[PDB]
Design an enzyme around this catalytic site. Structure first.
Site, mmCIF file in Angstrom:
data_model
loop_
_atom_site.group_PDB
_atom_site.id
_atom_site.type_symbol
_atom_site.label_atom_id
_atom_site.label_comp_id
_atom_site.label_asym_id
_atom_site.label_seq_id
_atom_site.Cartn_x
_atom_site.Cartn_y
_atom_site.Cartn_z
ATOM 1 N N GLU A 177 14.957 3.227 49.491
ATOM 2 C CA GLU A 177 13.530 3.539 49.321
ATOM 3 C C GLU A 177 12.670 3.185 50.542
ATOM 4 O O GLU A 177 11.565 3.606 50.603
ATOM 5 C CB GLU A 177 12.977 2.809 48.105
ATOM 6 C CG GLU A 177 13.215 3.497 46.793
ATOM 7 C CD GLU A 177 14.702 3.646 46.488
ATOM 8 O OE1 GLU A 177 15.298 2.579 46.191
ATOM 9 O OE2 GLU A 177 15.240 4.815 46.584
ATOM 10 N N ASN A 261 21.369 6.849 46.812
ATOM 11 C CA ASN A 261 20.612 8.079 46.985
ATOM 12 C C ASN A 261 20.280 8.336 48.447
ATOM 13 O O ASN A 261 20.081 7.405 49.211
ATOM 14 C CB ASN A 261 19.317 8.101 46.183
ATOM 15 C CG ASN A 261 18.433 6.949 46.513
ATOM 16 O OD1 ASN A 261 18.827 5.746 46.351
ATOM 17 N ND2 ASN A 261 17.210 7.241 46.951
ATOM 18 N N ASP A 303 16.532 10.966 42.750
ATOM 19 C CA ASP A 303 16.954 9.560 42.892
ATOM 20 C C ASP A 303 17.952 9.135 41.825
ATOM 21 O O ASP A 303 17.793 8.025 41.255
ATOM 22 C CB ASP A 303 15.718 8.661 42.888
ATOM 23 C CG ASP A 303 16.032 7.161 43.027
ATOM 24 O OD1 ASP A 303 16.852 6.819 43.838
ATOM 25 O OD2 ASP A 303 15.391 6.371 42.287
HETATM 26 O O1 LIG Z 1 18.117 2.513 47.127
HETATM 27 C C1 LIG Z 1 18.274 1.278 47.102
HETATM 28 O O2 LIG Z 1 18.861 0.702 48.035
HETATM 29 C C2 LIG Z 1 17.951 0.574 45.827
HETATM 30 C C3 LIG Z 1 18.094 -0.771 45.671
HETATM 31 C C4 LIG Z 1 17.864 -1.387 44.457
HETATM 32 C C5 LIG Z 1 17.999 -2.900 44.451
HETATM 33 O O3 LIG Z 1 18.384 -3.448 45.522
HETATM 34 O O4 LIG Z 1 17.946 -3.564 43.378
HETATM 35 C C6 LIG Z 1 17.611 -0.562 43.295
HETATM 36 C C7 LIG Z 1 17.512 0.864 43.575
HETATM 37 N N1 LIG Z 1 17.708 1.349 44.769
HETATM 38 C C8 LIG Z 1 17.295 1.885 42.481
HETATM 39 O O5 LIG Z 1 17.446 3.158 42.687
HETATM 40 C C9 LIG Z 1 17.183 1.421 41.106
HETATM 41 O O6 LIG Z 1 17.203 2.274 40.191
HETATM 42 C C10 LIG Z 1 17.157 -0.014 40.847
HETATM 43 C C11 LIG Z 1 17.030 -0.706 39.621
HETATM 44 C C12 LIG Z 1 17.133 -2.037 39.978
HETATM 45 C C13 LIG Z 1 17.101 -3.130 39.015
HETATM 46 O O7 LIG Z 1 17.679 -4.204 39.398
HETATM 47 O O8 LIG Z 1 16.704 -2.993 37.859
HETATM 48 N N2 LIG Z 1 17.304 -2.174 41.345
HETATM 49 C C14 LIG Z 1 17.403 -0.955 41.927
HETATM 50 CA CA LIG Z 2 17.283 4.214 45.001
#
Ligand SMILES: O=C(O)c1cc(C(=O)O)c2c(n1)C(=O)C(=O)c1cc(C(=O)O)[nH]c1-2
Ligand SMILES: [Ca+2]
Lengths: 573, 71
Positions: A177, A261, A303
């Site tokens: 992101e 993603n 995503d």
């Molecule tokens: O694209 C990324 O590198 C990244 C990292 C993270 C993260 O580090 O927890 C999440 C997401 N994306 C993401 O798409 C997502 O749905 C998400 C949910 C959570 C959570 O712990 O509930 N982290 C993350």
């Molecule tokens: Ca993501």
């Protein structure tokens, strides 16, 4: 690691987040079972001393429980013969600016462990949000080594757990992101020396491919695609971080995980398949070289970050006993692949309301897209299922090998989405879409489901008020345990889905339960402390429904049921 | 664009109706600054070089030291 594999087979231990290298999350312990779980009580509890989301769960090895926290990722050890005392503590000193570049709360999915060997004493491994991989002495807490993997100045953090394989510890990535190009890294457990590093996009040398990559399924794509499926240098900021879970087959000497993603979320800024984001990988352990790579979601528009867990099993496919991986993706499909060849066995909808894809053509391996549920500049796309939160997220699920059933905590969340143009600046967010999210057509936000992953046959399905985020534990007592966002731990009969027990924890749950035996008795342990993506609204006091990347409006009721917290609950009869 | 018409194995992307084959020069051109694009990889090289200093000091002395200015 053959000794870690052997410790995983001992019901006194819970040696990795996934329980064992197949990620079964299945215990042969039967003291606690479907006919007496109504009598389960709280045995003892611990405070973590932090708030924010508590993902993963404790490890237990050789009579010591290990606990970890969200930022600043404190760790402590507890001797199970003296549960009130902390044997040792480790308290990282991290730059507080790390918090500003975490997309989705300052969660940490937990510790890894390796037993003593030629490399030295038994070690606990911690990934810090600030991008360091740390090795600690498992008995004393002394810091042994520490290396820089990820740089927070580029928006690059760590949240997924380390993973030990032979003499290596694997460290993932996070920050798609913020336009982080994903990579996974193997470090030597003795001295923290980098052994290999495999990127998710870009030139073949960076991807780290075996000379026979996708030999078995050349229609998946082979060489040059990490460049040729992007326009120009857009791969350099192209996502594909791996912040989820791993599996390992010691007989094949292969490691399995999913890359996340592509960046930005704005699909129109990055024409092409965007390989090898959204890919199921099988990589040689020693070299990191990929033997297979299956892209689940070419040219992602939603995503559907492809990081979810990999659950290994051996099941009959057209009458032949076959080594498999099973993988419930964000995109709402459950993938089952031959884990030796990478051949697709099945790809079925986890809930029939999935609509971005009509079906996966099993012969071509391609998802047949429905353009009515595409995303694109200058259009507000409505009613897409799943939402970006997925019909499955980061929870580790469970497999009962006697029943041949997977038990999953499922999300039922859909969305409207409109992208926007925006520049990339290193260190800043790089999202480029505005979302509104809401329950799927069945009207609730979560489900728990039991399914056969080869046939796709749903055995049972039950609704939950909120998305079931933290995964599951199944046992030979005919029970599946899980925690809920609204702050229960619950147990259901794995034959029928019938609810057998529930207990009101202080705060919502975003990690999984564990079980272990200590001095002849069975215990069940879990973290309580809501957060992660569903809890961003309550954790950060957000009100705009499109805030928290669109989760705020969908989860606006969660704050009526839970506050933040941070505790470990241990139960027994 | 239904994802089944492939120019090459592993490469099935098409533009959606009315959108461009290539974004450079279009109304959807991302106009990325090549210097911004390169910053991540530069930062990785710098972390790798520090880590390698820490490793080499460990092999020389038998004692782990994180701060590279202290080696
Ligand atoms: O694209 C990324 O590198 C990244 C990292 C993270 C993260 O580090 O927890 C999440 C997401 N994306 C993401 O798409 C997502 O749905 C998400 C949910 C959570 C959570 O712990 O509930 N982290 C993350
Ligand atoms: Ca993501």
């Amino acid at each position: 690691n053959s000794e870690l594999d052997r410790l995983s087979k001992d019901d006194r231990n819970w040696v990795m987040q996934t329980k064992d290298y197949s990620a079964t999350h299945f215990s042969r312990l039967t003291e606690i079972n479907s006919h007496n779980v109504k009598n389960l009580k709280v045995a003892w509890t611990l405070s973590t001393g932090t708030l924010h989301g508590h993902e993963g769960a404790p490890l237990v090895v050789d009579g010591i429980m290990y606990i970890h926290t969200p930022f600043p990722n404190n760790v402590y050890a507890v001797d199970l013969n003296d549960t009130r005392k902390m044997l040792w503590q480790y308290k990282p000193k991290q730059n507080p600016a790390a918090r500003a570049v975490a997309c989705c709360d300052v969660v940490n999915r937990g510790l890894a462990y390796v037993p003593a060997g030629e490399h030295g004493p038994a070690k606990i491994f911690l990934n810090q949000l600030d991008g360091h991989i740390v090795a600690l002495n498992a008995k004393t807490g002394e810091e042994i080594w520490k290396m820089e993997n990820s740089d927070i100045a580029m928006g690059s953090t760590l949240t997924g757990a380390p993973f030990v394989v032979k003499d290596k510890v694997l460290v993932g990535s996070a920050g798609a992101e913020l336009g982080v190009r994903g990579y996974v890294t193997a470090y030597n457990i003795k001295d923290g020396k980098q052994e290999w590093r495999a990127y998710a996009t870009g030139p073949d040398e960076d991807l780290l491919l075996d000379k026979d990559f996708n030999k078995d399924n050349p229609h998946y794509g082979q060489f040059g695609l990490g460049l040729s499926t992007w326009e120009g240098d857009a791969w350099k900021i192209g996502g594909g971080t791996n912040w989820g879970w791993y599996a390992y087959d010691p007989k094949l000497d292969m490691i399995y995980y999913g890359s996340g993603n592509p960046a930005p979320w704005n699909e129109t800024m990055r024409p092409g398949d965007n390989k090898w984001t959204m890919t199921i990988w099988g990589r040689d352990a020693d070299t990191g070289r990929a033997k297979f790579g299956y892209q689940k979601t070419p040219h992602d528009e939603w995503d559907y970050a492809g990081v979810n867990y990999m659950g290994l099993s051996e099941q009959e496919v057209d009458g032949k006993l076959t080594p498999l991986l099973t993988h419930p993706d964000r995109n709402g499909l459950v993938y089952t692949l031959n884990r030796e060849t990478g051949a697709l066995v099945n790809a079925f909808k986890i809930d029939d309301t999935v609509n971005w894809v009509k079906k996966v053509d099993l012969k071509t391996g391609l998802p047949i897209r429905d353009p009515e549920y595409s995303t694109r500049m200058d259009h507000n796309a409505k009613g897409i299922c799943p939402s970006a939160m997925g019909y499955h997220n980061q929870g580790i699920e469970s497999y009962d090998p006697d029943k041949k059933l997977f038990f999953m905590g499922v999300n039922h969340i859909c969305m409207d989405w409109e992208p926007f143009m925006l520049p990339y600046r290193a260190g800043q967010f790089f999202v480029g879409a505005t979302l509104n999210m809401y329950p799927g057509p069945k009207g609730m936000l979560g489900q728990v489901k039991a399914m056969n992953a080869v046939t796709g046959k749903m055995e049972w399905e039950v609704p939950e008020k909120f998305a079931v985020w933290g995964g599951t534990l199944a046992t030979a007592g005919d029970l599946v345990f899980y925690g809920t966002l609204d702050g229960f731990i619950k147990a259901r009969d794995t034959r029928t889905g019938e609810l057998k027990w529930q207990f009101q924890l202080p705060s919502g749950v975003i990690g999984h339960p564990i079980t272990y035996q200590h001095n002849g008795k069975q215990y069940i342990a879990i973290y309580s402390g809501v957060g992660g993506w569903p809890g961003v609204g309550l954790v950060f006091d957000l009100k705009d429904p499109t805030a928290g990347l669109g989760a705020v409006g969908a989860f606006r009721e969660l704050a009526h049921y839970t506050q933040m917290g941070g505790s470990v609950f241990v139960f027994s009869l | 664009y239904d994802g089944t018409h492939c120019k090459a194995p592993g490469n099935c992307w098409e533009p959606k109706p009315g959108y461009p084959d290539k974004v450079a020069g279009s109304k959807y051109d991302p106009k990325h600054d090549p210097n911004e694009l390169n910053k991540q990889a530069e930062s990785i090289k710098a972390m790798e070089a520090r880590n390698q200093k820490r490793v080499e000091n460990y092999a020389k002395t038998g004692k782990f030291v994180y701060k590279v200015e202290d080696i």
